[PDB]
Enzyme design. Sequence first.
Site, PDB file in Angstrom:
ATOM      1  N   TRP A  55       0.842  -1.181   0.000  1.00  0.00           N
ATOM      2  CA  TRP A  55       0.000   0.000   0.000  1.00  0.00           C
ATOM      3  C   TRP A  55       0.900   1.262   0.000  1.00  0.00           C
ATOM      4  O   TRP A  55       1.814   1.345   0.792  1.00  0.00           O
ATOM      5  CB  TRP A  55      -0.909   0.039   1.265  1.00  0.00           C
ATOM      6  CG  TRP A  55      -1.539   1.387   1.453  1.00  0.00           C
ATOM      7  CD1 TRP A  55      -0.962   2.501   2.012  1.00  0.00           C
ATOM      8  CD2 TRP A  55      -2.803   1.822   0.942  1.00  0.00           C
ATOM      9  NE1 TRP A  55      -1.803   3.584   1.889  1.00  0.00           N
ATOM     10  CE2 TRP A  55      -2.951   3.186   1.265  1.00  0.00           C
ATOM     11  CE3 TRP A  55      -3.842   1.188   0.281  1.00  0.00           C
ATOM     12  CZ2 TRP A  55      -4.104   3.925   0.936  1.00  0.00           C
ATOM     13  CZ3 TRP A  55      -4.973   1.911  -0.048  1.00  0.00           C
ATOM     14  CH2 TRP A  55      -5.094   3.262   0.273  1.00  0.00           C
ATOM     15  N   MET A  56       0.603   2.216  -0.887  1.00  0.00           N
ATOM     16  CA  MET A  56       1.259   3.535  -0.958  1.00  0.00           C
ATOM     17  C   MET A  56       0.208   4.656  -0.955  1.00  0.00           C
ATOM     18  O   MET A  56      -0.779   4.583  -1.698  1.00  0.00           O
ATOM     19  CB  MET A  56       2.062   3.652  -2.275  1.00  0.00           C
ATOM     20  CG  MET A  56       2.750   5.027  -2.486  1.00  0.00           C
ATOM     21  SD  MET A  56       3.707   5.091  -3.960  1.00  0.00           S
ATOM     22  CE  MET A  56       2.358   5.365  -5.139  1.00  0.00           C
ATOM     23  N   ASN A  57       0.396   5.688  -0.125  1.00  0.00           N
ATOM     24  CA  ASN A  57      -0.352   6.947  -0.288  1.00  0.00           C
ATOM     25  C   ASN A  57       0.602   8.143  -0.448  1.00  0.00           C
ATOM     26  O   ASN A  57       1.416   8.109  -1.339  1.00  0.00           O
ATOM     27  CB  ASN A  57      -1.516   7.193   0.717  1.00  0.00           C
ATOM     28  CG  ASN A  57      -1.133   7.093   2.204  1.00  0.00           C
ATOM     29  OD1 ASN A  57      -0.754   6.032   2.681  1.00  0.00           O
ATOM     30  ND2 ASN A  57      -1.294   8.211   2.954  1.00  0.00           N
ATOM     31  N   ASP A  58       0.540   9.158   0.403  1.00  0.00           N
ATOM     32  CA  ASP A  58       1.043  10.518   0.065  1.00  0.00           C
ATOM     33  C   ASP A  58       2.516  10.595  -0.335  1.00  0.00           C
ATOM     34  O   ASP A  58       3.360   9.970   0.323  1.00  0.00           O
ATOM     35  CB  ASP A  58       0.960  11.462   1.243  1.00  0.00           C
ATOM     36  CG  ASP A  58      -0.303  11.454   1.976  1.00  0.00           C
ATOM     37  OD1 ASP A  58      -1.353  10.837   1.655  1.00  0.00           O
ATOM     38  OD2 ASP A  58      -0.290  12.163   3.016  1.00  0.00           O
ATOM     39  N   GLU A  86      -5.212  19.120   5.359  1.00  0.00           N
ATOM     40  CA  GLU A  86      -4.091  18.195   5.291  1.00  0.00           C
ATOM     41  C   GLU A  86      -3.087  18.738   4.304  1.00  0.00           C
ATOM     42  O   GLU A  86      -3.447  19.497   3.396  1.00  0.00           O
ATOM     43  CB  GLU A  86      -4.553  16.798   4.812  1.00  0.00           C
ATOM     44  CG  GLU A  86      -5.526  16.081   5.750  1.00  0.00           C
ATOM     45  CD  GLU A  86      -5.595  14.567   5.504  1.00  0.00           C
ATOM     46  OE1 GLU A  86      -5.538  14.107   4.318  1.00  0.00           O
ATOM     47  OE2 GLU A  86      -5.703  13.821   6.509  1.00  0.00           O
ATOM     48  N   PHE A 127       4.260   9.299   9.605  1.00  0.00           N
ATOM     49  CA  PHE A 127       3.298   9.995   8.779  1.00  0.00           C
ATOM     50  C   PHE A 127       3.989  11.021   7.839  1.00  0.00           C
ATOM     51  O   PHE A 127       5.222  11.152   7.786  1.00  0.00           O
ATOM     52  CB  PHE A 127       2.209  10.621   9.675  1.00  0.00           C
ATOM     53  CG  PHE A 127       1.069   9.659  10.091  1.00  0.00           C
ATOM     54  CD1 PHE A 127       1.188   8.268  10.030  1.00  0.00           C
ATOM     55  CD2 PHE A 127      -0.126  10.182  10.614  1.00  0.00           C
ATOM     56  CE1 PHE A 127       0.143   7.425  10.456  1.00  0.00           C
ATOM     57  CE2 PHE A 127      -1.183   9.350  11.013  1.00  0.00           C
ATOM     58  CZ  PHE A 127      -1.037   7.955  10.946  1.00  0.00           C
ATOM     59  N   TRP A 143      -3.893   0.332   4.038  1.00  0.00           N
ATOM     60  CA  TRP A 143      -3.163   1.258   4.878  1.00  0.00           C
ATOM     61  C   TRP A 143      -2.898   0.661   6.266  1.00  0.00           C
ATOM     62  O   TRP A 143      -3.781  -0.007   6.838  1.00  0.00           O
ATOM     63  CB  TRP A 143      -3.965   2.547   4.986  1.00  0.00           C
ATOM     64  CG  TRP A 143      -3.321   3.622   5.759  1.00  0.00           C
ATOM     65  CD1 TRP A 143      -2.604   4.669   5.255  1.00  0.00           C
ATOM     66  CD2 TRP A 143      -3.435   3.853   7.168  1.00  0.00           C
ATOM     67  NE1 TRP A 143      -2.218   5.512   6.267  1.00  0.00           N
ATOM     68  CE2 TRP A 143      -2.677   5.008   7.462  1.00  0.00           C
ATOM     69  CE3 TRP A 143      -4.059   3.165   8.229  1.00  0.00           C
ATOM     70  CZ2 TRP A 143      -2.540   5.508   8.759  1.00  0.00           C
ATOM     71  CZ3 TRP A 143      -3.923   3.664   9.523  1.00  0.00           C
ATOM     72  CH2 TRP A 143      -3.170   4.833   9.776  1.00  0.00           C
TER      73      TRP A 143
END
Length: 432
Positions: free
Chosen positions: A14-17, A190, A74, A41
């Site tokens: 999983w990859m986000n920002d 955000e 984060f 996530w």
Amino acid sequence: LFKPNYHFFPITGWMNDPNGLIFWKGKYHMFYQYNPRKPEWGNICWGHAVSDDLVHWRHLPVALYPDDETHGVFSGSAVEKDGKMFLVYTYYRDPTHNKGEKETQCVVMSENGLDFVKYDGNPVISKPPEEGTHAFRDPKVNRSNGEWRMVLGSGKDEKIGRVLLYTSDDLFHWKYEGAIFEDETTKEIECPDLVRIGEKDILIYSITSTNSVLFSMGELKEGKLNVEKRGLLDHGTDFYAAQTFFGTDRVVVIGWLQSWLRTGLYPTKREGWNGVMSLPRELYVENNELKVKPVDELLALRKRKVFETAKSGTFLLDVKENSYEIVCEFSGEIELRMGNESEEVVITKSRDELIVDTTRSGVSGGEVRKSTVEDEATNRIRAFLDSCSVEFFFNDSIAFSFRIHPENVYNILSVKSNQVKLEVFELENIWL
Ligand code: NA
């Protein structure tokens, strides 16, 4: 089938920002919110990639890990000080039955861009400035007026989203300068990023409920942003958590090419991975307007011209994969369709309005999005199609980004307009 040819995505999980975006010792570094364990996530690390040219990414070892199973590393940013790379980021502790989450801002350093060391005085900011502040996260640090400036996301009283400002002479000791901006439309802002382009202060930030990246442009005066113009950085369904590179001439943004709202609709999970990054865009100011265009380096992906026309019609494209760029110049109105016998995406300029329809695009369906646009004597649409995405750029000024999941190659193209000039370039696979 869904693995991108020329966008960045994780080897597994999983990859986000995007995080820590910096041009440092001649290379573009990109970090990212990462869970290698599964395509969902949690247990968040910072993954790490590098390129010479914003296009040809190479995976590197995971850079930053949480100390245990109930923390995460984060989002945050990167800066260069005394020739070294510094990452500034939010460290998160899970809530228990008795306590809410805890968020602090921390610093890590690297002399070589491979080995990352924790600063001994962490955290660098231990607590929020006022009672009732939450979502206290995502430090974006830049240089201004001989000082370091950090903007942070937050929300106040579960009521209003605000961007907090701190300053520092050394990166370790920070002074609170107050909230510079708020947005009544959300409980939390955000991923803020405060940039300067040609005498204007521009605040870019994300809002969760709508999964949008917004901007406010004006002038920072007396601890407050005086807004002259507001808008969206992207008008499609999948662009979020945009960040700008430290250390470049241009203002270059990359966003997460996905939406939290639409994540459970997507099928890449079945291949063991989730998450894609957007192509990089340059931000600039012309005629008092913030504009967005693809970065020039993307031209290096063009490997061959497979089609061209100067007439309306429907055309069979000699392409074997969804890895291509449409460049189309036209006057007045247009309808452009790309697809196959069962699937399509449509873009239409009708009078005053640019509209994009991905509802019939593939196995995740899609949506219709629209923007009012200014006509030019010659209008230009540039479209990048990859295995699970399409990004549209109009008059080097506005962007619409969408995730799509076609079951087959989009080998049929149809255009209708006067004065059409259209070409298609096959685009390189950056991996092999
Ligand atoms: Na250090």
